[PDB]
Amino acid sequence: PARLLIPEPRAGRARHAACVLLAVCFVVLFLAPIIRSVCTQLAALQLGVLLKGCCCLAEEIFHLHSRHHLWQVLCSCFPPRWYLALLLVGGSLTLSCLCQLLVLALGLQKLSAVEVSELTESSKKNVAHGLAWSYYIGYLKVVLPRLKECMEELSRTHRDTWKLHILVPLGCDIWDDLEKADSNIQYLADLPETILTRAGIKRRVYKHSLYVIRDLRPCVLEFASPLQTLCAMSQDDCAAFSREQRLEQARLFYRSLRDILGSSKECAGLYRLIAYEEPHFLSGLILWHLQQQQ
Amino acid sequence: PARLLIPEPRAGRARHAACVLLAVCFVVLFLAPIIRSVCTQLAALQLGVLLKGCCCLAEEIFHLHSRHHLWQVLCSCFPPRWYLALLLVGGSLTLSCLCQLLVLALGLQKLSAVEVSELTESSKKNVAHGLAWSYYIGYLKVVLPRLKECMEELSRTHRDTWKLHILVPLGCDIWDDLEKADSNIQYLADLPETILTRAGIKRRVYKHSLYVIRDLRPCVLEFASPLQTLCAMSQDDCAAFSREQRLEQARLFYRSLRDILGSSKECAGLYRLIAYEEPHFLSGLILWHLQQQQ
Numbered sequence: 001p002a003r004l005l006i007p008e009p010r011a012g013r014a015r016h017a018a019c020v021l022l023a024v025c026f027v028v029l030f031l032a033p034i035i036r037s038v039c040t041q042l043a044a045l046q047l048g049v050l051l052k053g054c055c056c057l058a059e060e061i062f063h064l065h066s067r068h069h070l071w072q073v074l075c076s077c078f079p080p081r082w083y084l085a086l087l088l089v090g091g092s093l094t095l096s097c098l099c100q101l102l103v104l105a106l107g108l109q110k111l112s113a114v115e116v117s118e119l120t121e122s123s124k125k126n127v128a129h130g131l132a133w134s135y136y137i138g139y140l141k142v143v144l145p146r147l148k149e150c151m152e153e154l155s156r157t158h159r160d161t162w163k164l165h166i167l168v169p170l171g172c173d174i175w176d177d178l179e180k181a182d183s184n185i186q187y188l189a190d191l192p193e194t195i196l197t198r199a200g201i202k203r204r205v206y207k208h209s210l211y212v213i214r215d216l217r218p219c220v221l222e223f224a225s226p227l228q229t230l231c232a233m234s235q236d237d238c239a240a241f242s243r244e245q246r247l248e249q250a251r252l253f254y255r256s257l258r259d260i261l262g263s264s265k266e267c268a269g270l271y272r273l274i275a276y277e278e279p280h281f282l283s284g285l286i287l288w289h290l291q292q293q294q
Numbered sequence: 295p296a297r298l299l300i301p302e303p304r305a306g307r308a309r310h311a312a313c314v315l316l317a318v319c320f321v322v323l324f325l326a327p328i329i330r331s332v333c334t335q336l337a338a339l340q341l342g343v344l345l346k347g348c349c350c351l352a353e354e355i356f357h358l359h360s361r362h363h364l365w366q367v368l369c370s371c372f373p374p375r376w377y378l379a380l381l382l383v384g385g386s387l388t389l390s391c392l393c394q395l396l397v398l399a400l401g402l403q404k405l406s407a408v409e410v411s412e413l414t415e416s417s418k419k420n421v422a423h424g425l426a427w428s429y430y431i432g433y434l435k436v437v438l439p440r441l442k443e444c445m446e447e448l449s450r451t452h453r454d455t456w457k458l459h460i461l462v463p464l465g466c467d468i469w470d471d472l473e474k475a476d477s478n479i480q481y482l483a484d485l486p487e488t489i490l491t492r493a494g495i496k497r498r499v500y501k502h503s504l505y506v507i508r509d510l511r512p513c514v515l516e517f518a519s520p521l522q523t524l525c526a527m528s529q530d531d532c533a534a535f536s537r538e539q540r541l542e543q544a545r546l547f548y549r550s551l552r553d554i555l556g557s558s559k560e561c562a563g564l565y566r567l568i569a570y571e572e573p574h575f576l577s578g579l580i581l582w583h584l585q586q587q588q
């Protein structure tokens with residue numbers, strides 16, 4: 001199997017390194033008269049933060065009813081601990097205000113790549129987590145409990161392997177015809193369908209397929225579909241989206257899906273996530289996962 | 295029809311208000327000796343930004359190969375115009391460094407609601423835009439060109455109305471049985487299906503339905519499905535997601551879908567977005583949209 005390097009979540013040791021550098025710099029400040037001097041700089045920052053809120057009253061007043069329907073807007077305007085800044089302003093000029101305005105005009109407070117990356121993958125509001133929730137709720141929550149009955153119905157036409165391997169290709173190749181993927185992968189038949197009236201559509205139909213892979217074992221197998229969506233979210237270039245970020249979002253999607261099916265409760269063992277990169281081959285990986293459980 | 299208040303995109307007039315306040319404050323500074331003093335504050339900011347990059351070398355060194363595979367990491371570490379800060383540091387102490395570290399330790403640089411809102415909806419990497427791209431590529435790109443042929447095939451069993459009204463309920467109510475939605479909405483039949491081998495599944499089936507609404511007109515009609523996903527992304531509470539943000543994300547989804555089908559090229563006039571809030575009724579709105587085109 002190929003080496004799976006998916007990124008871990010952020011541990012948050014940067015604050016620890018900042019604290020250590022703070023303590024070391026205080027020790028070198030060792031080897032009372034200057035503490036007031038600290039305040040002469042400190043509220044100098046906390047003015048400008050307030051200034052940012054003042055400018056954020058600018059556009060938000062054009063969004064009163066359409067986004068916020070007064071006190072809600074000013075509640076949303078500045079960071080929530082606003083009284084510390086005024087508390088520090090009271091404990092004491094135009095140069096500071098003009099410097100903060102000269103910063104805020106030219107826009108030199110642009111965050112870097114790693115900061116927006118941690119802000120993206122920290123919140124659960126990016127593309128990959130929402131799309132993984134869509135794939136979990138819309139498909140996997142519904143089909144997977146009805147898998148064993150259709151398997152038994154085809155059985156009247158190996159109980160360890162009655163699962164649903166989801167191929168998750170961390171990359172670009174997504175194929176509709178898996179018989180073009182290898183000469184070893186062969187189509188045999190399909191499962192009995194599933195009929196559900198979902199979201200106004202009456203009798204929506206979910207299907208499957210059964211693939212026999214030999215040298216001599218059957219399995220159910222399909223691709224994780226919405227990666228295909230990402231495959232058109234950068235090729236068509238109508239979304240601001242790059243290939244390196246495409247690989248990043250695919251790894252994030254596999255990580256989020258692994259997390260969701262980790263704490264899943266209905267999906268007992270019926271799923272089996274197979275993920276890979278491009279280093280024939282795919283049948284060899286399928287056979288390795290298939291023999292691994294036995 | 296109900297009043298549709300969807301939020302406009304950010305115009306960006308806050309920078310203009312900052313510039314005006316800058317010019318006015320410079321005029322009051324009117325009515326050369328102090329400009330060097332500006333630099334004594336100015337690089338005082340640009341040190342600390344560099345300090346943030348120093349702390350962002352901390353956790354990123356635990357993410358060398360798993361996210362970035364040296365120079366790529368330091369390239370991603372600080373904001374890209376790094377030389378202006380060192381240029382300003384050269385033009386001239388421990389108090390400034392300790393103040394910036396004391397800020398970065400306690401974490402008082404937390405962005406407000408409106409800043410993270412503009413950062414979210416500014417980039418095309420939130421939940422609603424990616425999910426709208428999924429609904430456009432997976433379903434609307436495929437089905438809609440094959441609509442007229444199925445309509446003509448049922449016609450051999452009103453050409454102005456041969457469309458697909460997508461009900462987009464900006465809210466919480468999403469129903470599977472539209473006959474429970476009103477006594478006026480009646481199910482009649484379904485369109486001939488669509489069979490496509492998509493993403494490894496052989497013979498995936500797309501269906502539709504035809505609803506006759508009288509007092510005396512037929513139409514095709516369905517719900518925008520993945521809003522249902524959002525309806526379970528906060529009720530089950532396994533995602534950090536609120537109801538006010540649910541209404542916000544639904545409005546954002548309708549806006550993004552309106553934008554995508556605005557610049558669409560295959561979907562000629564075959565879609566017709568109907569969106570509403572909860573103020574019987576739904577049939578009255580459907581009849582108003584249906585009579586509006588004629």
Ligand SMILES: Nc1nc(=O)c2ncn([C@@H]3O[C@@H]4COP(=O)(O)O[C@H]5[C@@H](O)[C@H](n6cnc7c(N)ncnc76)O[C@@H]5COP(=O)(O)O[C@@H]3[C@@H]4O)c2[nH]1
Pocket residue numbers: 134135138139199201204205206207225226229428429432433495498499500501516519520523
């Ligand atoms: N009304 C309606 N009838 C349909 O047959 C249908 N099929 C798809 N869709 C909607 O279009 C989009 C395309 O599916 P996508 O591939 O991007 O992810 C889909 C897809 O990965 C998976 N899935 C759903 N139905 C099938 C299916 N029959 N076969 C394989 N996978 C499916 O579940 C994901 C989410 O489905 P929904 O989020 O409930 O609505 C889908 C989706 O929004 C349909 N909408």
